[PDB]
Amino acid sequence: PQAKYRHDYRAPDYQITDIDLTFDLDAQKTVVTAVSQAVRHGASDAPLRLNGEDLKLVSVHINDEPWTAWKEEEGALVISNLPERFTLKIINEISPAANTALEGLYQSGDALCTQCEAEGFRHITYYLDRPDVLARFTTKIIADKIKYPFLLSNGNRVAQGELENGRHWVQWQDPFPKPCYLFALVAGDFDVLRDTFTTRSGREVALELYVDRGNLDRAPWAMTSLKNSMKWDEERFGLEYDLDIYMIVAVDFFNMGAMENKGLNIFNSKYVLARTDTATDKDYLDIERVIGHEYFHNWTGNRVTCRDWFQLSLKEGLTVFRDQEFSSDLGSRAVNRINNVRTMRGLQFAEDASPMAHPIRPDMVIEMNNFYTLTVYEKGAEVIRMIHTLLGEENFQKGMQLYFERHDGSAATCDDFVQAMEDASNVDLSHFRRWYSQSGTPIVTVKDDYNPETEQYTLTISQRTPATPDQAEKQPLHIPFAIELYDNEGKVIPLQKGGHPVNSVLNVTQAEQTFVFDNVYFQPVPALLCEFSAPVKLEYKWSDQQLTFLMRHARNDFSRWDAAQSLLATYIKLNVARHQQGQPLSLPVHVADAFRAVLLDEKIDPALAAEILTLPSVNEMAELFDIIDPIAIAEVREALTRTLATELADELLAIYNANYQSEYRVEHEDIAKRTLRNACLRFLAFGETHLADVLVSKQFHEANNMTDALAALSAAVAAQLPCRDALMQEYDDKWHQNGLVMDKWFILQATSPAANVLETVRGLLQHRSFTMSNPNRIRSLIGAFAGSNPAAFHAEDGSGYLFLVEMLTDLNSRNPQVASRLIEPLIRLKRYDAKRQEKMRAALEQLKGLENLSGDLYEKITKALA
Numbered sequence: 001p002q003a004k005y006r007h008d009y010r011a012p013d014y015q016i017t018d019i020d021l022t023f024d025l026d027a028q029k030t031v032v033t034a035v036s037q038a039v040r041h042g043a044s045d046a047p048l049r050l051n052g053e054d055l056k057l058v059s060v061h062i063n064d065e066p067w068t069a070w071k072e073e074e075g076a077l078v079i080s081n082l083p084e085r086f087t088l089k090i091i092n093e094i095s096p097a098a099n100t101a102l103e104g105l106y107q108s109g110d111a112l113c114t115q116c117e118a119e120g121f122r123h124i125t126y127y128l129d130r131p132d133v134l135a136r137f138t139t140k141i142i143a144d145k146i147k148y149p150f151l152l153s154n155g156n157r158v159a160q161g162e163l164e165n166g167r168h169w170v171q172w173q174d175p176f177p178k179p180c181y182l183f184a185l186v187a188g189d190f191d192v193l194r195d196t197f198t199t200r201s202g203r204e205v206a207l208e209l210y211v212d213r214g215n216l217d218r219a220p221w222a223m224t225s226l227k228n229s230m231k232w233d234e235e236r237f238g239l240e241y242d243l244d245i246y247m248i249v250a251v252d253f254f255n256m257g258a259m260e261n262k263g264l265n266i267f268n269s270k271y272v273l274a275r276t277d278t279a280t281d282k283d284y285l286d287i288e289r290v291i292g293h294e295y296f297h298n299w300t301g302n303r304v305t306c307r308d309w310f311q312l313s314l315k316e317g318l319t320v321f322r323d324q325e326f327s328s329d330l331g332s333r334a335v336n337r338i339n340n341v342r343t344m345r346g347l348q349f350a351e352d353a354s355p356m357a358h359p360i361r362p363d364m365v366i367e368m369n370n371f372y373t374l375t376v377y378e379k380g381a382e383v384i385r386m387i388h389t390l391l392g393e394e395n396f397q398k399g400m401q402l403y404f405e406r407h408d409g410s411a412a413t414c415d416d417f418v419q420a421m422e423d424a425s426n427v428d429l430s431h432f433r434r435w436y437s438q439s440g441t442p443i444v445t446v447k448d449d450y451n452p453e454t455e456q457y458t459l460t461i462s463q464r465t466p467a468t469p470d471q472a473e474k475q476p477l478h479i480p481f482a483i484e485l486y487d488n489e490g491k492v493i494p495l496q497k498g499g500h501p502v503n504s505v506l507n508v509t510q511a512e513q514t515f516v517f518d519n520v521y522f523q524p525v526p527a528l529l530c531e532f533s534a535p536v537k538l539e540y541k542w543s544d545q546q547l548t549f550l551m552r553h554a555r556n557d558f559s560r561w562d563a564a565q566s567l568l569a570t571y572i573k574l575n576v577a578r579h580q581q582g583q584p585l586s587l588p589v590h591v592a593d594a595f596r597a598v599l600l601d602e603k604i605d606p607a608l609a610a611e612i613l614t615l616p617s618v619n620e621m622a623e624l625f626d627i628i629d630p631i632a633i634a635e636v637r638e639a640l641t642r643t644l645a646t647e648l649a650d651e652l653l654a655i656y657n658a659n660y661q662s663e664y665r666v667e668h669e670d671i672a673k674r675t676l677r678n679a680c681l682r683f684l685a686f687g688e689t690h691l692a693d694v695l696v697s698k699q700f701h702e703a704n705n706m707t708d709a710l711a712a713l714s715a716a717v718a719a720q721l722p723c724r725d726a727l728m729q730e731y732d733d734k735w736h737q738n739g740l741v742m743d744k745w746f747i748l749q750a751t752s753p754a755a756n757v758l759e760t761v762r763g764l765l766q767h768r769s770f771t772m773s774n775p776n777r778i779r780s781l782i783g784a785f786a787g788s789n790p791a792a793f794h795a796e797d798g799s800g801y802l803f804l805v806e807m808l809t810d811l812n813s814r815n816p817q818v819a820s821r822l823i824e825p826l827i828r829l830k831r832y833d834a835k836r837q838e839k840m841r842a843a844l845e846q847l848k849g850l851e852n853l854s855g856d857l858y859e860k861i862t863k864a865l866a
Ligand SMILES: NC(=[NH2+])NCCC[C@H](N)C(=O)O
Pocket: 115, 117, 118, 255, 256, 257, 258, 259, 260, 316, 369, 372, 817
């Protein structure tokens, strides 16, 4: 498979302006007729090169003339000797039922549906399958009326008809030019939730959510979130929906999360379907996020699209930033920022240290589906948020307005967006652009000095980014570095120098620099990198008392949580070293007292308390170490939980009881109290056994919602409580017919600390609720084992690696995108000890030798083995 490079971008030799599609739909054999109006922009002797994959070509006409000047090559139809303007007609066949990869036109249960991003439209017809080619689409769909009573494509219905032999047809027209990755088609039988939204300016939009028959009871929250998203985009960004109808289709078979096809979003059902007995608080908030996300793409992705796929973060970074701002505005900003920071430090930093490291705008891609990454999305959003930090809200919105004014109706680049922000705000972002082209996490080192004679506080800040596998050369970045200084009473000391205020966002642009502040009337406790103001590792020599002081006094709730994380990091590192020596947990009394104080603080927001009382995950803990010892980390996390459970037992029980709620509400105050109560339950589960067992069993049985039932079930599994097997069997007996609910249970099985977890996981491949045909099931069992049970995945006998090899040998052929998600834990081998590295390397070498190795796996395996 061949790598493509960003620097090789060239404008296309041909454009297509209009395409008229006809689908004669059938699961075994679909006939596609595509009539394209094309224009040659290049040299009269340049051929038209159409992308196409697994298509059976029936005919090629140019202006109704059967065409003889063409050839098929690997992945292409190359058409020669064309006039400057012409009509291209292609007829071809495809086979939706054979499409197990779920890219192009495929089958999801009884439905037919599409996934075209990034390069799936070439699996439907021969096309200029590249996002700088925008065209106006019409789509005629002909199908069996009984099997496919709903026939949907982008835009508005403009025609419809009945045919003989029980067939019917519908034709759709979308007035906005689009790249073909935004094309969608859906055919099937559905329940439809219908509602309306009236925009600020008075446009009435029909909202339609299509769900499998029988699921209308699980649709209203997604509909509510859609209306919430539309309203928010109006209030916050001044953006209105631009069509007459908004369709969402929930499908059970879907590779990723959801897809922003214009006017016809297609969603993994996990991000649509929710009822209080099936879905947790986190499911409701994820539905809200993803619904908003795809909606936000209407402007940031659709009205302005991507010139080429190396510009992916132009839409994904910006849209993730928007979904975070949406969630943060509607809910707890602090909890959102905290959770997004966990994801950055715990998952994205790991990617930026891995063989798959890339800048947010990549330079080299073999398989573009490999670049839908934590980096492109989450780090891309941190880069957008840094622009917001540098510019302020008002200048940021002016930049947004200039971006749309310049680029509406076109395909743009990351550079175009930065340029708009810079021009609108008059903030110079020339140095800042390096964030787009440089991979790896910067390390920011801070030294400080207080001078009592001059009342001056001096910060010496240095930065470096270590070399990554993809880039030998690194340079200093423009790092917005937000600080606060606290006096002995917990009050903020005004920042100033030479009689003038100083902005609290420091511009750290050099390898090393010194910031001096005057009138610093007391030796400060600093809050550094406030609200995680740049996506960097902070090296500062904190004392425990500085951190507990910030926990108590810091102005922003995020800083209080972050201080608790820095406090814990020291002791996680200590205790992992001790575990390796065979020693038990050591924890100063004053550290345990810090957490007791949070439990007993009556003024603290319970949402904040809950996060401080949620220990860093084994993934967040892993990024504290150069060499990861996954067994030590898992055992230390447990022991730290047991120690705090013992030390805080009475307080934990009191707070658990105090936060009891009889009514279930998906409302932020209620969610916060419930999150705190279940955080207390998790510690209690690891306390005295009989009490743990009674508490956990009682909560499982008395829960009037899935959040509380699952929190109890999960604690029963984590703490290996007596009641575990019973509750697990009850849940299976109740829920086996519901795949999305069973995904929770498969995750609990996959992440079990039990000695025999791999044996149980292998057996579950035969479970009534599991199937290798379904990406959600695969990810919930196998993915959760490899990715979220690193202790068992990295069992010293190499059994975890061998299991994953077996699964990937199947999935390489069945669904390479899902296989490529699942290989990720194996490509981290250089983070592990030599003995584990040699086994993981052997596993990778075995996969490399697969007959018909997918480009998806090839790209990752070769980087990992280099
Ligand atoms: N199979 C894929 N590569 N899917 C990518 C679709 C992601 C979609 N644009 C989103 O932001 O959610």
